[PDB]
Design a protein around this ligand. Sequence first.
Ligand SMILES: [Mg+2]
Ligand SMILES: [Mg+2]
Ligand SMILES: [Mg+2]
Ligand SMILES: [Mg+2]
Ligand SMILES: [Mg+2]
Ligand SMILES: [Mg+2]
Ligand SMILES: [Zn+2]
Length: 198
Amino acid sequence: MIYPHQYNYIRSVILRLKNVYKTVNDKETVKVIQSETYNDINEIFGHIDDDIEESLKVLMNIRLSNKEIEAILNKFLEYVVPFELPSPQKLQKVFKKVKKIKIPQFEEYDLKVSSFVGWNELASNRKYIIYYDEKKQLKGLYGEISNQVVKGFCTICNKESNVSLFMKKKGDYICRDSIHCNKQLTDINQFYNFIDKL
RNA sequence: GAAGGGCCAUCGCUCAACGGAUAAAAGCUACCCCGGGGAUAACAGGCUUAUCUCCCCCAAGAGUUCACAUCGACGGGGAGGU
Ligand SMILES: [Mg+2]
Ligand SMILES: [Mg+2]
Ligand SMILES: [Mg+2]
Ligand SMILES: [Mg+2]
Ligand SMILES: [Mg+2]
Ligand SMILES: [Mg+2]
Ligand SMILES: [Zn+2]
């Protein structure tokens, strides 16, 4: 079992390796990336199954294919555990102030790749985000979200993309989609740092 | 004669549930009872469709480039009657 952010990190290194094959014309430079990618996967899993080894083998080969990548990603995805959505009665305890709070249905894959879950009402222009801390107690935050979206560096994912200003007076632009933000996010601590910044 | 009445004048009410039932009044019933009501609720039907489910319009964008492979922000229009 691996964290969502870890999987995103694995995905990124795999994409890098494919990009390296695409761009780099030197095998030796490629080899260093191949080893680094291998090391990164070895960092993720203390013990690697034969399927992971097969995936590594496919990754190691210079002639990587996007279908092969997707298959490797699917195998890695299986290891990942989806984010647990709270019970509505539990959620009501999380958000007592909020009345008739509604969570949009999340795809299982989305939950698997999402370190945290967040949704915006839009009608009230308020975004509600739920996450499990290091203590593993679910923490819900409700804050105003700007309707306007403009490209900007986002603290939550630590990436530059189209973002919506979030208010909860310091103002920070955050990605409109939390799932998109999660996909961009590579470390759960980085999201925690954003929460600490709040 | 007086006592006590009448007439005139005036005083005493958050009688505020303010045309004030008495000077004087709160609750429980799954131990319940009678007379009634579909004039009125709980089930199902009917109407309705906010909500809900589903389908669309525009296409900012994402997708190496490339809106429309796939996905689709902000908005807009419906259908169904679970
Ligand atoms: Mg009266
Ligand atoms: Mg009376
Ligand atoms: Mg009777
Ligand atoms: Mg009737
Ligand atoms: Mg009937
Ligand atoms: Mg339609
Ligand atoms: Zn973000």
